[PDB]
Design an enzyme around this catalytic site. Structure first.
Site, PDB file in Angstrom:
ATOM      1  CG  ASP A   8      -1.621   1.264   1.535  1.00  0.00           C
ATOM      2  OD1 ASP A   8      -1.717   1.648   2.715  1.00  0.00           O
ATOM      3  OD2 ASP A   8      -2.161   1.857   0.576  1.00  0.00           O
ATOM      4  CG  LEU A   9       1.971   5.597  -2.068  1.00  0.00           C
ATOM      5  CD1 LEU A   9       3.385   5.166  -2.416  1.00  0.00           C
ATOM      6  CD2 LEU A   9       1.323   6.253  -3.265  1.00  0.00           C
ATOM      7  CG  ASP A  10      -1.229   7.643   3.450  1.00  0.00           C
ATOM      8  OD1 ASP A  10      -0.327   8.463   3.721  1.00  0.00           O
ATOM      9  OD2 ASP A  10      -2.240   7.499   4.159  1.00  0.00           O
ATOM     10  CB  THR A  16       0.408  10.369   0.332  1.00  0.00           C
ATOM     11  OG1 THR A  16      -0.726   9.591   0.729  1.00  0.00           O
ATOM     12  CG2 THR A  16       1.450   9.465  -0.300  1.00  0.00           C
ATOM     13  CG  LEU A  44      -9.436  16.042   6.676  1.00  0.00           C
ATOM     14  CD1 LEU A  44      -8.594  17.022   5.890  1.00  0.00           C
ATOM     15  CD2 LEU A  44     -10.902  16.180   6.311  1.00  0.00           C
ATOM     16  CE  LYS A  45      -4.592   6.713   9.556  1.00  0.00           C
ATOM     17  NZ  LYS A  45      -3.249   6.880  10.173  1.00  0.00           N
ATOM     18  N   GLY A  46      -8.473   8.419   5.840  1.00  0.00           N
ATOM     19  CA  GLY A  46      -9.315   7.364   5.289  1.00  0.00           C
ATOM     20  C   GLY A  46     -10.650   7.851   4.747  1.00  0.00           C
ATOM     21  CB  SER A  48     -14.041   9.919  -0.262  1.00  0.00           C
ATOM     22  OG  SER A  48     -15.198  10.578   0.229  1.00  0.00           O
ATOM     23  CB  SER A  52     -11.780  15.308   2.596  1.00  0.00           C
ATOM     24  OG  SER A  52     -11.417  14.024   3.061  1.00  0.00           O
ATOM     25  CB  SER A 114      -1.371   2.826  -4.143  1.00  0.00           C
ATOM     26  OG  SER A 114      -1.840   4.059  -3.628  1.00  0.00           O
ATOM     27  CB  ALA A 115      -6.855   3.774  -4.206  1.00  0.00           C
ATOM     28  CB  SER A 116      -2.078   7.004  -5.067  1.00  0.00           C
ATOM     29  OG  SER A 116      -1.414   8.172  -5.528  1.00  0.00           O
ATOM     30  CE  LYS A 145      -5.862  -0.163  -0.690  1.00  0.00           C
ATOM     31  NZ  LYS A 145      -4.634   0.545  -0.228  1.00  0.00           N
ATOM     32  CD  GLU A 169      -3.800  -1.035   3.226  1.00  0.00           C
ATOM     33  OE1 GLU A 169      -4.022  -0.291   4.209  1.00  0.00           O
ATOM     34  OE2 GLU A 169      -4.089  -0.715   2.064  1.00  0.00           O
ATOM     35  CG  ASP A 170      -1.930   2.788   6.748  1.00  0.00           C
ATOM     36  OD1 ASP A 170      -2.138   2.366   5.599  1.00  0.00           O
ATOM     37  OD2 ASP A 170      -2.223   3.945   7.125  1.00  0.00           O
TER      38      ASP A 170
END
Ligand code: MG
Length: 221
Positions: A8-10, A16, A44-46, A48, A52, A114-116, A145, A169-170
């Site tokens: 996963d990225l972030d 990010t 704002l974590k997780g 959309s 947001s 990642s969804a980035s 996810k 993942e986090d």
């Protein structure tokens, strides 16, 4: 033995969320909304892009047209693109570069899950492009996810079945996505946020090839 690690990225490779924060702070100051500080960023974590923006408008009980809402979300995206030009190898989380080196030397495939929309650019900014074998195809991701789509796509992109992979993942939604893909999840974070059932590590420095091998062999019972 596992044949791939799906990243996963972030929250795994880098942060990010900090750049998303700087993007939102820039937008808020332009339209005159106070309150977009570090403590507000936790809300704002997780969440959309649309939800947001709504939370930022809610800070001033501001109502906008559907067209202006779309324009503001676009302006934030433009701000984000400008902010991430500053991403450098110093942004890479502890232990991640050494893990990438160790996986590559042991011929274990590395995939970005990642969804980035800025995934490959961010890997380039971080000087990590050479370690990645493939990035998940966004055209093979119908839902995000907790849906397993992204991890199934990441595994397939490197030529393996999800069941032959480990996913890092986090987030709770991301852990559920790895579980439903067939891959083995190893989470990073607090036990209060993620849950007992899967293997969790406090931070990314614990993500070593030695540890991934140990966890894999232990879950083969
Ligand atoms: Mg994450």
């Amino acid at each position: 033995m596992f044949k791939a690690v799906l990243f996963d990225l972030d929250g795994v490779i880098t942060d990010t969320a900090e750049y998303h924060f700087r993007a939102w702070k820039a937008l808020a100051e332009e339209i005159g909304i106070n309150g977009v500080d570090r403590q507000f960023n936790e809300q704002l974590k997780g969440v959309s892009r649309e939800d947001s923006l709504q939370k930022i408008l809610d800070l001033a009980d501001k109502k906008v047209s559907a067209e202006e809402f779309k324009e503001l979300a676009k302006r934030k995206n433009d701000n984000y693109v400008k902010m991430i030009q500053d991403v450098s190898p110093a942004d890479v989380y502890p232990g991640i570069l050494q893990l990438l080196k160790d996986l590559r030397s042991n011929k274990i495939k590395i995939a970005l899950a990642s969804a980035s929309k800025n995934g490959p650019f961010l890997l380039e900014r971080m000087n990590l492009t050479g370690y990645f074998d493939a990035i998940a195809d966004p055209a093979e991701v119908a839902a995000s996810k907790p849906a397993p789509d992204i991890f199934i796509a990441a595994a397939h992109a490197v030529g393996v079945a999800p069941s032959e992979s480990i996913g890092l993942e986090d987030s709770q939604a991301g852990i559920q996505a790895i579980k439903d893909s067939g891959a083995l999840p190893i989470g990073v974070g607090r036990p209060e946020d993620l849950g007992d059932d899967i293997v969790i590590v406090p931070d990314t420095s614990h993500y070593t090839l030695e540890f991934l091998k140990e966890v894999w062999l232990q879950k083969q019972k």
